[PDB]
Amino acid sequence: APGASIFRCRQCGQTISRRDWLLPMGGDHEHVVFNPAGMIFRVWCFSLAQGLRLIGAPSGEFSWFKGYDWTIALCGQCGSHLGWHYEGGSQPQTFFGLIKDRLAEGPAD
Numbered sequence: 001a002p003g004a005s006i007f008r009c010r011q012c013g014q015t016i017s018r019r020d021w022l023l024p025m026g027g028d029h030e031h032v033v034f035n036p037a038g039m040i041f042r043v044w045c046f047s048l049a050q051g052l053r054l055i056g057a058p059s060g061e062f063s064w065f066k067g068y069d070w071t072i073a074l075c076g077q078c079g080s081h082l083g084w085h086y087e088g089g090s091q092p093q094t095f096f097g098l099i100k101d102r103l104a105e106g107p108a109d
């Protein structure tokens, strides 16, 4: 009966990822970053996620992760901006950077 197994969208409950899929990029699964508008994000990196909708074509502009291009990842249910999908890089080729405070963590179902 673990209570820290599954990450859901904090706004609607859509299943998004799992603690087991946490990915330590550059030695840490947590990355604190700012965008050009100055917003600060505490981003958790995951190997896999589901329940998202990836919007548009990838861009390398302002990428927080060297060698990766990003696409916006919205909750596929409610449209809440949950983070980004990264692609085009090496080891791994792709991963997800999701905004920790926009997810709710809980037991598996």
Ligand SMILES: O=C1CC[C@H](N2C(=O)c3ccccc3C2=O)C(=O)N1
Residues within 6 Å of the ligand: 034, 035, 036, 037, 061, 062, 063, 064, 065, 070, 084
């Ligand atoms: O890796 C990334 C993900 C995208 C993120 N980003 C944003 O959060 C944003 C908002 C508005 C205009 C442009 C951007 C942008 O590049 C950013 O700054 N770096």
Ligand SMILES: [Cl-]
Residues within 6 Å of the ligand: 099, 101, 102
């Ligand atoms: Cl936030």
Ligand SMILES: [Zn+2]
Residues within 6 Å of the ligand: 009, 010, 011, 012, 013, 014, 075, 076, 077, 078, 079, 080
């Ligand atoms: Zn949602």
